[PDB]
Coordinates of C-alpha atoms (C1' of nucleotides) and ligand atoms in Angstrom, one line a residue:
Chain A
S1 CA 83.2 107.6 171.0
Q2 CA 85.2 108.0 167.8
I3 CA 88.7 109.2 168.1
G4 CA 87.9 112.6 166.9
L5 CA 85.3 113.1 170.0
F6 CA 87.8 111.3 172.3
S7 CA 90.5 113.5 171.2
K8 CA 88.3 116.6 172.2
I9 CA 87.0 115.3 175.4
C10 CA 90.8 114.4 176.5
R11 CA 92.1 117.7 174.6
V12 CA 94.8 115.7 172.9
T13 CA 95.8 115.3 169.3
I14 CA 94.7 112.5 167.3
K15 CA 98.0 111.4 166.4
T16 CA 98.7 111.1 170.2
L17 CA 95.7 108.7 170.4
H18 CA 97.3 106.7 167.3
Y19 CA 100.5 106.7 169.3
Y20 CA 99.3 105.3 172.5
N21 CA 97.3 102.8 170.8
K22 CA 100.5 101.8 168.7
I23 CA 102.6 101.5 171.7
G24 CA 100.1 99.7 173.9
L25 CA 99.7 102.5 176.3
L26 CA 95.8 103.3 175.5
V27 CA 94.0 100.8 173.6
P28 CA 90.5 101.7 172.3
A29 CA 87.6 99.7 173.8
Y30 CA 86.7 98.5 170.7
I31 CA 88.2 98.8 166.8
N32 CA 86.0 98.2 164.1
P33 CA 87.2 95.4 162.1
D34 CA 86.6 96.3 158.7
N35 CA 87.1 100.3 158.7
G36 CA 89.7 100.1 161.6
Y37 CA 88.1 102.8 163.2
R38 CA 88.8 103.2 166.8
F39 CA 86.2 103.6 169.5
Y40 CA 86.6 104.8 172.8
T41 CA 84.9 104.4 176.2
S42 CA 84.6 106.3 179.6
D43 CA 86.8 103.7 180.9
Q44 CA 89.6 104.8 178.5
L45 CA 89.1 108.3 179.6
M46 CA 89.9 107.0 183.2
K47 CA 93.1 105.7 181.9
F48 CA 94.1 108.6 179.7
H49 CA 93.9 110.8 183.2
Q50 CA 96.3 108.7 184.9
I51 CA 98.6 108.9 181.6
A52 CA 98.5 112.6 181.6
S53 CA 99.0 112.6 185.4
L54 CA 102.2 110.8 185.1
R55 CA 103.2 112.4 182.1
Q56 CA 102.9 116.0 183.7
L57 CA 105.7 114.7 185.9
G58 CA 108.0 114.5 183.3
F59 CA 108.1 110.6 183.4
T60 CA 109.1 109.1 180.0
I61 CA 106.4 107.0 178.1
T62 CA 107.9 103.6 178.9
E63 CA 107.9 104.6 182.5
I64 CA 104.3 105.4 182.4
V65 CA 103.7 101.9 180.6
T66 CA 105.7 100.2 183.3
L67 CA 104.0 102.2 186.3
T68 CA 100.4 101.7 184.9
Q69 CA 100.7 97.9 183.9
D70 CA 102.9 96.7 186.7
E71 CA 102.3 97.6 190.4
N72 CA 104.7 98.0 193.2
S73 CA 107.2 100.2 191.1
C74 CA 108.0 102.6 193.9
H75 CA 111.8 102.3 192.6
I76 CA 110.9 104.2 189.6
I77 CA 109.3 107.0 191.1
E78 CA 112.4 107.2 193.4
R79 CA 114.5 107.3 190.2
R80 CA 112.7 110.0 188.5
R81 CA 112.6 111.9 191.8
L82 CA 116.5 111.6 191.9
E83 CA 117.1 112.6 188.4
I84 CA 114.5 115.5 188.9
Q85 CA 116.9 116.8 191.9
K86 CA 119.9 116.0 189.7
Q87 CA 118.6 118.0 186.6
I88 CA 117.6 121.0 189.1
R89 CA 121.2 120.9 190.3
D90 CA 122.5 121.2 186.9
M91 CA 119.8 123.7 185.9
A92 CA 120.9 126.1 188.4
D93 CA 124.6 125.4 187.2
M94 CA 123.5 126.5 183.9
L95 CA 121.5 129.3 184.7
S96 CA 124.4 130.6 186.9
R97 CA 126.5 130.4 183.6
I98 CA 124.1 132.0 181.2
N99 CA 123.6 135.1 183.9
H100 CA 127.5 135.1 184.2
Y101 CA 127.8 134.9 180.1
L102 CA 125.2 138.1 179.8
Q103 CA 127.1 140.2 182.5
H104 CA 130.1 139.7 180.5
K105 CA 128.7 140.2 177.1
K106 CA 127.1 143.4 178.4
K107 CA 130.7 144.1 180.2
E108 CA 132.8 143.6 177.0
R109 CA 131.5 144.0 173.6
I110 CA 133.6 141.4 172.0
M111 CA 134.0 138.1 174.0
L112 CA 137.6 137.1 174.0
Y113 CA 137.5 134.2 176.7
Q114 CA 134.7 131.4 176.8
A115 CA 134.8 129.2 179.7
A116 CA 134.4 125.4 179.1
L117 CA 134.0 123.0 181.9
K118 CA 135.9 119.7 180.9
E119 CA 137.2 116.5 182.8
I120 CA 140.8 115.7 182.5
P121 CA 142.0 112.1 182.7
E122 CA 144.2 110.6 185.0
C123 CA 148.0 110.8 183.7
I124 CA 151.5 109.7 184.3
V125 CA 154.0 112.6 184.3
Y126 CA 157.3 113.6 185.1
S127 CA 157.7 116.7 187.3
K128 CA 160.1 119.1 188.9
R129 CA 158.5 121.4 191.3
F130 CA 161.0 124.4 192.0
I131 CA 160.8 128.0 193.2
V132 CA 161.0 130.4 190.0
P133 CA 162.8 133.6 190.0
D134 CA 160.5 135.2 187.3
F135 CA 157.8 133.9 184.7
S136 CA 160.3 135.3 182.0
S137 CA 163.1 133.2 183.5
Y138 CA 160.6 129.9 183.8
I139 CA 160.9 129.5 180.2
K140 CA 164.6 129.2 180.2
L141 CA 165.2 126.1 182.2
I142 CA 162.6 123.8 180.5
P143 CA 164.6 123.1 177.2
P144 CA 167.4 121.6 179.4
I145 CA 164.9 119.2 181.0
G146 CA 163.6 118.4 177.7
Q147 CA 167.0 117.4 176.5
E148 CA 168.2 115.9 179.6
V149 CA 165.3 113.5 180.3
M150 CA 165.6 112.1 176.8
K151 CA 169.1 111.4 177.2
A152 CA 168.7 110.1 180.5
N153 CA 165.4 107.9 179.9
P154 CA 166.2 106.4 176.7
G155 CA 163.3 105.3 174.5
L156 CA 160.8 107.1 177.0
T157 CA 157.7 107.9 174.6
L158 CA 155.7 110.9 175.6
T159 CA 151.9 110.2 175.3
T160 CA 149.7 111.3 172.4
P161 CA 148.0 114.0 172.6
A162 CA 150.9 115.5 174.3
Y163 CA 149.5 117.1 177.8
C164 CA 152.5 119.4 178.9
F165 CA 151.5 121.6 181.7
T166 CA 152.3 123.8 185.0
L167 CA 151.1 123.5 188.5
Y168 CA 150.9 126.7 190.3
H169 CA 151.6 125.9 194.0
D170 CA 151.1 129.3 194.9
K171 CA 148.0 130.3 196.6
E172 CA 148.3 134.1 195.9
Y173 CA 149.6 136.1 193.1
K174 CA 153.5 137.2 193.0
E175 CA 155.7 137.7 190.1
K176 CA 159.2 136.9 191.5
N177 CA 158.8 134.3 194.1
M178 CA 156.4 131.5 192.3
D179 CA 156.7 128.2 193.8
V180 CA 155.7 126.4 190.2
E181 CA 156.0 122.9 189.2
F182 CA 156.7 121.8 185.5
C183 CA 154.8 118.7 184.4
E184 CA 154.9 116.4 181.3
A185 CA 152.6 113.5 180.6
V186 CA 154.3 110.2 179.5
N187 CA 152.9 107.0 178.6
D188 CA 154.5 104.5 181.0
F189 CA 156.4 104.7 184.4
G190 CA 160.1 105.3 184.8
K191 CA 163.3 106.1 186.9
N192 CA 163.3 109.0 189.4
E193 CA 166.9 109.9 188.8
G194 CA 167.6 113.8 189.7
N195 CA 165.2 116.6 190.7
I196 CA 162.9 115.1 188.0
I197 CA 160.3 112.6 189.4
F198 CA 157.5 110.4 188.1
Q199 CA 154.1 110.6 189.6
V200 CA 150.5 110.2 188.4
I201 CA 148.1 113.2 188.4
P202 CA 144.3 112.4 189.4
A203 CA 141.5 112.8 186.9
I204 CA 139.7 116.3 187.8
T205 CA 137.0 118.1 186.5
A206 CA 138.4 121.5 185.7
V207 CA 137.0 124.7 184.2
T208 CA 139.3 125.8 181.3
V209 CA 139.8 128.9 178.9
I210 CA 142.3 128.7 176.1
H211 CA 144.2 131.9 175.6
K212 CA 145.5 132.7 172.3
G213 CA 148.4 135.3 172.0
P214 CA 151.3 136.4 174.1
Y215 CA 152.1 135.4 178.1
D216 CA 151.5 138.9 179.1
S217 CA 147.8 139.0 179.0
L218 CA 147.2 135.8 180.8
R219 CA 146.5 137.7 183.9
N220 CA 143.3 138.6 182.0
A221 CA 142.3 135.2 181.8
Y222 CA 142.8 134.3 185.4
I223 CA 140.9 137.2 186.7
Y224 CA 138.1 135.9 184.4
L225 CA 138.2 132.5 185.5
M226 CA 138.7 133.3 189.2
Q227 CA 135.5 135.8 188.4
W228 CA 133.8 132.8 187.1
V229 CA 134.9 130.8 190.1
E230 CA 133.5 133.5 192.3
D231 CA 130.2 133.9 190.4
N232 CA 129.3 130.2 189.7
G233 CA 130.0 129.1 193.3
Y234 CA 132.8 127.0 192.5
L235 CA 135.8 126.0 194.9
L236 CA 139.3 125.5 193.7
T237 CA 140.2 121.9 194.6
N238 CA 143.7 121.6 193.4
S239 CA 146.5 123.5 191.8
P240 CA 146.1 125.3 188.7
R241 CA 147.5 123.8 185.7
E242 CA 148.9 125.5 182.3
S243 CA 148.8 123.4 179.3
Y244 CA 151.0 124.7 176.4
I245 CA 149.1 123.4 173.2
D246 CA 150.7 125.5 170.3
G247 CA 153.9 127.8 170.8
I248 CA 157.1 128.6 169.3
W249 CA 157.7 125.1 168.6
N250 CA 155.2 124.9 165.6
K251 CA 155.1 128.4 164.6
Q252 CA 157.1 131.4 164.9
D253 CA 154.7 134.2 165.3
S254 CA 154.1 134.8 169.2
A255 CA 150.4 136.3 168.9
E256 CA 149.2 133.2 167.3
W257 CA 150.6 131.0 170.3
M258 CA 147.8 129.2 172.3
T259 CA 147.9 127.7 176.0
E260 CA 144.9 126.3 178.1
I261 CA 144.4 127.5 181.8
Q262 CA 142.9 124.9 183.8
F263 CA 141.1 125.6 187.4
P264 CA 140.4 122.4 189.1
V265 CA 136.8 123.0 190.8
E266 CA 133.8 121.6 192.4
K267 CA 130.8 123.2 192.8
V268 CA 130.3 124.4 196.6
Chain B
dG1 C1' 161.1 95.5 145.2
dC2 C1' 156.1 91.5 146.7
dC3 C1' 153.3 90.6 150.7
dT4 C1' 151.3 91.1 155.4
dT5 C1' 149.6 94.1 159.7
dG6 C1' 147.5 96.7 162.6
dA7 C1' 145.6 100.8 162.8
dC8 C1' 142.9 104.3 161.3
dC9 C1' 139.4 106.6 157.9
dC10 C1' 135.6 107.2 154.7
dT11 C1' 130.3 107.2 153.5
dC12 C1' 126.0 105.4 153.8
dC13 C1' 122.0 103.4 156.2
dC14 C1' 119.5 102.8 160.6
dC15 C1' 118.4 104.1 165.3
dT16 C1' 116.9 107.3 169.0
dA17 C1' 111.3 109.9 172.0
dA18 C1' 106.9 111.4 171.3
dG19 C1' 104.4 112.4 168.5
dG20 C1' 103.6 116.1 163.9
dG21 C1' 102.7 116.5 159.1
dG22 C1' 101.0 115.1 155.1
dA23 C1' 99.7 112.1 151.4
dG24 C1' 96.6 108.9 149.4
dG25 C1' 92.9 106.0 150.3
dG26 C1' 88.1 104.6 152.2
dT27 C1' 83.2 105.7 154.0
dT28 C1' 78.7 108.4 154.1
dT29 C1' 75.7 112.3 153.4
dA30 C1' 67.7 111.2 154.3
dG31 C1' 63.1 118.2 152.3
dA32 C1' 62.9 117.2 147.1
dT33 C1' 64.8 117.4 142.2
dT34 C1' 63.6 111.8 137.4
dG35 C1' 65.1 112.5 129.0
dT36 C1' 71.7 115.5 126.5
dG37 C1' 71.9 119.4 123.6
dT38 C1' 76.1 120.8 120.5
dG39 C1' 77.0 122.1 115.9
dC40 C1' 77.4 122.9 110.5
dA41 C1' 77.6 123.1 105.7
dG42 C1' 79.7 127.1 99.2
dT43 C1' 83.4 118.9 97.2
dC44 C1' 83.2 116.8 93.0
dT45 C1' 83.4 112.5 91.2
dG46 C1' 83.6 107.8 90.7
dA47 C1' 82.2 103.6 92.2
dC48 C1' 79.9 100.0 95.0
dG49 C1' 76.0 97.8 97.3
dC50 C1' 70.9 97.8 98.1
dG51 C1' 65.9 98.5 98.7
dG52 C1' 62.2 98.7 95.7
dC53 C1' 59.4 98.9 91.5
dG54 C1' 58.6 96.2 87.3
Chain C
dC1 C1' 65.1 88.1 89.4
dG2 C1' 66.7 92.5 86.7
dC3 C1' 67.4 97.3 87.0
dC4 C1' 67.3 102.4 89.2
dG5 C1' 67.7 106.0 92.2
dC6 C1' 69.8 106.5 97.0
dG7 C1' 73.1 105.8 100.8
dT8 C1' 77.9 105.5 101.7
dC9 C1' 83.1 105.4 101.0
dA10 C1' 87.7 107.2 99.4
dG11 C1' 91.2 110.8 97.1
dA12 C1' 92.8 115.4 96.6
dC13 C1' 101.8 120.0 96.4
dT14 C1' 107.2 120.9 100.0
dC15 C1' 111.3 125.7 101.8
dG16 C1' 111.2 130.1 106.1
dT17 C1' 108.7 131.8 111.1
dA18 C1' 104.8 131.0 114.3
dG19 C1' 103.5 127.8 116.8
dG20 C1' 98.3 126.0 122.1
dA21 C1' 94.0 126.4 123.9
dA22 C1' 91.6 129.8 126.7
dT23 C1' 84.0 127.1 130.5
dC24 C1' 82.1 123.7 133.9
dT25 C1' 84.6 121.5 139.3
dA26 C1' 82.0 118.8 148.1
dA27 C1' 83.0 118.1 152.9
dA28 C1' 83.7 115.7 157.2
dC29 C1' 85.3 111.9 159.1
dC30 C1' 88.5 108.0 159.5
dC31 C1' 92.5 104.9 158.4
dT32 C1' 97.5 103.3 157.2
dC33 C1' 102.1 104.7 155.7
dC34 C1' 106.1 107.5 155.2
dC35 C1' 109.0 111.1 156.2
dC36 C1' 110.3 114.2 159.9
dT37 C1' 112.2 116.3 164.1
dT38 C1' 117.8 116.3 168.8
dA39 C1' 122.5 115.4 168.5
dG40 C1' 124.7 112.2 167.6
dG41 C1' 125.5 106.3 168.2
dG42 C1' 126.2 101.9 166.1
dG43 C1' 127.4 99.0 162.3
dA44 C1' 128.5 97.3 157.5
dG45 C1' 131.0 97.5 153.7
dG46 C1' 135.0 99.4 151.4
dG47 C1' 139.6 102.3 151.3
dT48 C1' 143.9 104.1 153.2
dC49 C1' 148.5 104.8 155.8
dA50 C1' 152.5 104.1 157.5
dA51 C1' 155.2 100.0 160.0
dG52 C1' 157.8 96.8 158.5
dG53 C1' 158.7 90.9 156.9
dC54 C1' 161.1 88.5 153.5
Ligands
1N7_301 C1 144.9 132.7 190.9 C2 146.1 131.7 191.3 C3 146.2 131.2 192.8 C4 145.1 130.4 193.0 C5 147.5 132.8 191.0 C6 148.6 132.5 192.1 C7 150.0 132.4 191.3 C8 149.3 133.0 190.0 C9 150.3 132.7 188.7 C10 151.7 132.9 189.0 O1 151.9 134.4 189.5 C11 152.5 132.8 187.4 C12 151.9 133.7 186.5 C13 152.2 135.0 186.5 C14 151.5 136.0 185.5 O2 152.1 137.4 185.6 C15 150.0 135.9 185.5 C16 150.0 134.5 185.2 C17 150.4 133.4 186.2 C18 150.1 132.0 185.6 C19 149.5 133.7 187.7 C20 148.0 133.5 187.4 C21 147.2 133.5 188.7 O3 147.2 135.1 189.1 C22 148.0 132.5 189.8 C23 148.0 131.1 189.1
118_302 C1 160.2 118.6 177.1 C2 160.3 118.6 176.0 C3 159.5 119.6 174.7 C4 159.1 120.7 175.4 SB1 158.4 122.2 174.3 C5 157.9 123.7 175.5 C6 156.6 123.8 176.0 C7 156.2 125.0 176.7 C8 156.9 126.0 176.9 C9 158.4 125.8 176.3 C10 158.5 124.8 175.8 C11 156.5 121.1 173.5 C12 156.5 120.6 172.2 C13 155.4 120.3 171.6 C14 154.3 120.1 172.3 C15 154.3 120.6 173.4 C16 155.4 121.2 173.9 C17 159.7 122.6 172.6 C18 159.9 121.6 171.7 C19 160.6 121.8 170.6 C20 161.3 123.3 170.6 C21 161.2 124.4 171.5 C22 160.1 124.0 172.6 C23 159.0 120.8 176.9 C24 159.6 119.8 177.7

DNA sequence: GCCTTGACCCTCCCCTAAGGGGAGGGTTTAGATTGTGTGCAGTCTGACGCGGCG
DNA sequence: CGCCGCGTCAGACTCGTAGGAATCTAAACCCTCCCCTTAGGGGAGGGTCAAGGC
């Protein structure tokens, strides 16, 4: 049986048989020496059936080679099974994210706020945890901290890139009684003089949105991130962070400012 | 200023999985078939070499 | 060997623009080889950017 007849018996392409002969998965029963013509046999079909049976389970080709040439490989079927359930979990996550994306696109004609899930590494910060009378007043006590720390900690170099964020320890929304905590990432440890203390913040997987524009429409992004959290079955594991990437310090226009809100979450 | 130094940065080339697509090359093919197929040309005049007759 | 008619070969003005020539024609197989596909990774080779050190 030539390769054209075998490809019609097997209902597979000829190039598939060429590839399987090249890699050594399915070798023809007899190859004509002068022409090169591959000839196949029923005993090759009995093996192509096994190849197809394994390949329909999503096994990679090299896994199929290992399974059919070397027996007692029950660890490879377990690896493929665990990977299949992991991919199923990831696929359910992706499905929820794309359903949410369509309900939002069908909600507002322009999408102002995309949501991205990113992992934040561990870091060394100096932090001051304090009760703030108003969000407008929160901005006032930060530049005092910025000069005082550089005067009190000489040669202290902030990391690059600059991770300067806020920990919202409030489990509910309020305007005037915010128990907030100002953090700023630094390269190495230091002295803990004053109300400013040093600490490490654990690496977290967090869903983040970057808000461009003034600080009054941030409630939109928070409700959106909360909406994302309720829609996609995540649970808030830690306090939300507020990372100030660009602001009045690089650019004078207040509507081009940008900050990224991070929601530490786990899928539950 | 001349000279190193460590960190960055660029393009370019090759690699990934499982074949698809195509180019460019071989091979045979068993009713019987058995000799091509066009023109075209109104030149003249020298001049040379040769079959054939004497 | 000597001469006569026959076969053959070689020559024949310079400017612009138009300006070529146009028919006829396997198919089904197989092979190898080369490039292609994600979304980038890895490395070689070669440049470049601020630090300073004398
Ligand atoms: C969902 C979240 C708890 C979890 C609640 C509890 C504390 C709330 C923030 C603070 O109020 C400060 C600030 C007020 C602005 O007005 C809107 C933005 C800010 C960041 C709020 C957003 C959001 O509503 C927070 C994080
Ligand atoms: C210590 C030192 C600098 C800043 Sb800022 C800032 C950030 C958020 C809100 C208000 C101010 C900063 C600069 C670069 C990158 C990230 C943050 C800052 C710097 C100069 C002038 C005004 C503000 C804060 C603390």
